[PDB]
Design a protein around this nucleic acid. Structure first.
Ligand SMILES: COc1ccc2ncc(F)c([C@@H](O)C[C@H]3OC[C@H](NCc4ccc5c(c4)OCCO5)CO3)c2c1
Ligand SMILES: [Cl-]
Ligand SMILES: [Cl-]
Ligand SMILES: [Cl-]
Ligand SMILES: [Mn+2]
Ligand SMILES: [Mn+2]
Lengths: 675, 674
DNA sequence: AGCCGTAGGGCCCTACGGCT
DNA sequence: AGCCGTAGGGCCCTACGGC
């Protein structure tokens, strides 16, 4: 893949490292083929600080870099055997390019340190605003990044070797705590020309950029709507295109393309997979996407290519987006500044706990189980009537997690500790039974598997335990699952063998029993925070108060404006002859504006609304419609002002709407909790 | 492997379904009955055994997986008793490509498992139409409509005449194209366990796929010179107004919009089509303006469509000009939820301007690009003399003009190609011999032939030098750059004749390449081999029809607006009685009737009055109405004049074509040496 | 050959944290 | 010692005709 240069004089040669062929194209097209070589990599490279040496020396990209440099590694390193005197790191100008840069620097530092000490490692500075170099034209990339007469390179300098070792081991090592602490200490949450660059400063700044971006803008959900940026951008994308349940499905290809061009500047696989997960009833306790086609199965089967499937909203997603266009939530600019996206959805039901979450960030992660919507809402209502409610009282309503795959939970200890601190292991067990099958023989029937368990992989594991004789008593192992019966895994037992013992062994040796490690970390005020049940419900309730409040304010301003216009039009109808006369005798529409305003004490917008009136509106029924709309509008205004007068009426309104959602979408519990 | 076998092991009641891929294997595996129904997902088009040799067949993954799944062997080692299933159900997608796949599968079974067909073990599923594939259906639907034995409708393949079957498979699937082309020409019609004869299935399915590829994939239309994918792309860029004046648009949005609206096929085909249309070394007149990495002459593909952007070129507007003026017939799309153009107005001769290249079924096409100035000059000459000959046209259209410049040797091949539609044209690189210091010389190549991969050519030369198949070359370099352009340097050994080396390179490398002109195009939706004059004729007739329908559209529009303006002049002449008439009316319908009866107004006129905004009652508005009405009368007169005499119509076509020439015409790039 | 260009179809490397 | 789920990145079979 290396696109070497013509010259073979390392003193004037230089190799550029890019993320892939999408960038290698523009780079190869704009380069100077006499003294500039190009090595396209394949995305994220291996982290040598965590992987073992055998895996490093067998990695394709690593070996290709060693070959390209021809200097060796470790003790066999020879600076004189360098085929280039400048190794230019030129990743994409994004957070992932920063991560890649930190990985590359780690490799060079752990296996080619003299290359850094000699000042052979440089950093290219492509302009910002591009998702990658593949989006830039060749001439632009040449003039702004590669042309020696205009480029601005940073030469990597190694000052303190001890602080460098500590930095690389801290940020890239396998000890998470040091990294989390670094983030906590340095994270700044938002509410020709060859400069030298200290490798420590570059590692800390780049890795901090990637880490922050992953924490606040990728892996972790927001406590208010319980959504990550990709899911939020997906659903909003389905909203701006009117992909409502009443209207037909929409082509998944169009959805992913629109979302990717407008809001989510990342690969299609991430978006489409996210939507697929949101459409699967075995993954989402309350699915947010209605899918047409093959959206996978419990056996790990992925979804069909997006070019075959379609999707629209679910009825409850409408409740996630309800009132989003009434100044309830703050919009923000997108990545390219050509669109507006919601920073959060109204989330008229507690989504975070309803569907749960699970994300692997940097220096931390999150794992929240789903719950029953009825129980959640009942808990919110109890909290609204008692700010001092305790966790146990909440648990009178919220018995515990409620997984879409049903199943069993052993004991409330793990639940209790998880709701009281935000961390706790919960023992999930399949629903299995023992029954006869004729001739004094027995079998074990599994009808419900644990949450996030691959059924086919489980059955495969059992087949292994049977083959290796690591479990005795099993004679046959079938999977009679079907749509007309549901999950049904049959495990024949050998005659005269105790099936309960075999079952306990299966619980001990297979995913038939799995633990869920609750670790409820979520974004609060745009900051990662470990929260308990009460805090989550509280932040959600506050979000609801703010939502309904801002909605009432919006509807009030709108209603008042419409009331003013309707007043202008009612005046016009009371003096239609005077109006017509005023207009006809005016040469221009501006003169008509001024004359109407001055003669009828009308505002600019009222005279404008009169000038825009169609003659058909002078028919009787149209006048009646205007009057009626005005009176009803006065009543509506009075009701709104009533809501904004007393906070108890507002809060009770939140209670009423939450109760409506509960009565409409609430369902029975699926997962049984045994004492 | 990918096989998802069933629980039972009794072949008499077992049955295996063959699907095109995993997107369908998902729905099939979710909706099946896992006790007696197995599933084998393939990987798209399988190998055509009628054409491939045994070594290639026995190393194909899908073939071997099918043999394994059946467990019967192949050839003479076939044993029906070892069959793991008694029903091999072919269930490809309900489309033309699924029909092609079906013919391939049937071919394999017939040449390697004939007793399986004789015993009636091969069946064909009949999934409902309207889905791009089974991956678009839900599992319950697929089960109830196709797999459920209590309602499905299978076709059992029966082999009656073995001789006619052999001749059929050798004819449709064999490696002799002429027989296949003849079959298409003779049978192509261009616009519950039933038994099914394998011959009828092969002929019908293969004819379906063949027709679809000929008229709806590989071959262009003579009028706009576009294939369905390019037309649907450009139209897609037009429905969102992604014009050159506006900023670029994300390629992902373009491909998604086109694929959901018009082109129900893979994203790779669409995106590659747009990329080619954006490449200045591929299109003599690029129709797409690309932002990002859209490839190079060294075969380097374009960046993923998540990085690149694209909009129209200024000349594409001339392809779309007057589209909304009833110039071209619109049609329904594949799902019946959209309208697409069957052809673009094509205000300049695109087919010959950018050329074409397509591999269909039973035939193919290869048309070189040309110079727009010369083409237009030829069209104008033709409009003044229907009896013009090929040589006269060649007085204007000297020959092909490739975007890569280059050289063409002699007009013999050109002349034969323009006269008959078929002809070889010798393209030669632009090479020179120059000194490089110390009595040594080099060969500098600055222009390569059309559709030649520069890096691959250089590799070929390196091979000839390494293999000692050519003497005199000492070094080889590619000094190409944006500041210089194509520049391949070939050092010559001192005291060696460089002209001989250059001639040898022309004889032994792509430095000289042949272009096999084979101008086949769709005329009235039928493939036809055409010459230069015929192409120019069909195009000119398309222009005449376009401008005619445009003039008619503008005439009807102008007359309608004049009628409305008459109504409005009446309304303003009696504004008081109008207002009173409306006020006394309860409903808008009553007002309509009263106005019509009291002022001799039509429905649309009274409607236009009722929809009039009060701002239109200012004094100056009446004057504006009068002026617009008079100018409209003059305009009507001009239009009717144009539609009265065909000579002024043709002269208008000449005027617009001349304007296009003056705006977009450019100099010739390829030199033609005698 | 093996390439041209529209079509069918699909799988494998990496980072990151926590639990097993 | 391997999975969960958002992210970075990419390559290889096939049909079809003509030279
Ligand atoms: C599929 O299995 C493999 C196996 C091996 C592969 N080797 C290299 C390799 F690059 C790949 C993949 O990139 C090939 C391909 O590109 C990316 C994906 N495009 C799908 C798509 C469709 C429609 C769209 C869209 C994206 O974006 C927005 C608008 O509409 C799918 O996969 C490989 C893939
Ligand atoms: Cl934290
Ligand atoms: Cl209106
Ligand atoms: Cl079409
Ligand atoms: Mn990138
Ligand atoms: Mn298909």
């Amino acid at each position: 893949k290396l696109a070497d240069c013509s010259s073979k004089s390392p003193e004037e040669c230089e190799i550029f490292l890019v993320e892939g062929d999408s960038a290698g194209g523009s780079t190869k097209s704009g380069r100077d083929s006499r003294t500039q070589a190009i090595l396209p990599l394949r995305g994220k490279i291996l982290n040598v600080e965590k992987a073992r040496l055998d895996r490093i020396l067998n990695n394709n990209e690593i070996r290709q870099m060693i070959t390209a440099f021809g200097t060796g590694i470790g003790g066999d390193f020879d600076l004189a055997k360098a085929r280039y005197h400048k190794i230019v790191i030129m990743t994409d100008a994004d957070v992932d390019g920063a991560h890649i840069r930190t990985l590359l620097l780690t490799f060079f530092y752990r296996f080619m340190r003299p290359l850094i000490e000699a000042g052979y490692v440089y950093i290219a500075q492509p302009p910002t605003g591009y998702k990658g170099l593949g989006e830039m034209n060749a001439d632009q990339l040449w003039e702004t990044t590669m042309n020696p007469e205009h480029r601005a390179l940073l030469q990597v300098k190694l000052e303190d070797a001890i602080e460098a070792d500590q930095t690389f081991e801290m940020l890239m090592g396998d000890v998470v705590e040091n990294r989390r602490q670094f983030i906590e200490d340095n994270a700044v949450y938002a509410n020709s020309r060859i400069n030298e660059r200290n490798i420590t400063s570059e590692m800390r700044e780049s890795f901090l950029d990637y880490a922050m971006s992953v924490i606040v803008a990728r892996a972790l959900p927001d406590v208010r709507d319980g959504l990550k940026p990709v899911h939020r951008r997906i659903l909003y994308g389905l909203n701006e295109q009117g992909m409502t349940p009443d209207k037909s499905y929409k082509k998944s290809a169009r959805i992913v393309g629109d979302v990717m061009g407008k809001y989510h500047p990342h690969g299609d696989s991430s978006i489409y997979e996210a939507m697929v997960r949101m459409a699967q009833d075995f993954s989402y306790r309350y699915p947010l996407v209605d899918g047409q086609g093959n959206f996978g199965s419990m056996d790990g089967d992925g979804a069909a290519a997006m070019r075959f499937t379609e999707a629209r909203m679910t009825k409850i997603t409408l409740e996630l987006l309800r009132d989003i266009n009434k100044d309830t939530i703050d919009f923000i600019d997108n990545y390219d500044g050509n669109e507006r996206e919601p920073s959060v959805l109204p989330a008229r039901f507690p989504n975070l706990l309803a569907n749960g979450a699970s994300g692997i960030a940097v220096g931390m992660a999150t794992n929240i189980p789903p719950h029953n919507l009825t129980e959640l809402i009942n808990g919110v209502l109890s909290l609204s009537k008692n700010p001092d409610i305790s966790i146990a009282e909440l648990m009178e309503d919220i018995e515990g997690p409620d997984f879409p795959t049903a199943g069993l939970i052993l004991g409330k200890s793990g639940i209790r500790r998880a709701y009281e601190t935000g961390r706790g292991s919960i023992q999930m067990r399949s629903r299995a039974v023992i029954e006869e099958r004729g001739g004094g023989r027995q079998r074990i029937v599994v009808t419900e598997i644990p949450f996030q368990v691959n059924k086919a992989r489980m059955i495969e594991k059992i087949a292994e335990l049977v083959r290796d004789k690591k479990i005795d008593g099993i004679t046959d192992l079938r999977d009679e699952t079907s749509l007309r019966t549901g999950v049904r895994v049959v495990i024949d037992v050998r005659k005269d063998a105790n099936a309960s013992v075999i079952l306990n062994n299966l619980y001990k040796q297979t995913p038939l029993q799995t633990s869920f490690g609750v670790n409820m970390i979520a974004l609060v005020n745009g900051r990662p925070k470990l929260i308990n049940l009460k805090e989550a419900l509280v932040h959600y309730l506050e979000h609801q108060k703010t939502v309904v409040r801002r909605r009432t304010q919006y509807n009030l301003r709108k209603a008042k404006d419409r009331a003013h216009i309707l007043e202008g039009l009612r005046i016009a109808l009371d003096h239609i002859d005077e109006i017509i006369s005023t207009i006809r005798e005016s040469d221009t529409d501006k003169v008509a504006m001024e004359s109407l305003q001055q003669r009828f004490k009308l505002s600019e917008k009222q005279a404008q609304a009169i000038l825009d009136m169609r003659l058909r509106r002078l028919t009787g029924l149209e006048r009646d419609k205007i009057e009626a709309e005005y009176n009803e509008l006065l009543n509506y205004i009075s009701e709104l002002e009533t809501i904004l007068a007393d906070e108890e009426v507002l809060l009770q309104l939140v209670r009423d709407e939450l109760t409506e959602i509960r009565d409409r979408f609430g369902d029975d519990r699926r997962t049984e909790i045994q004492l």
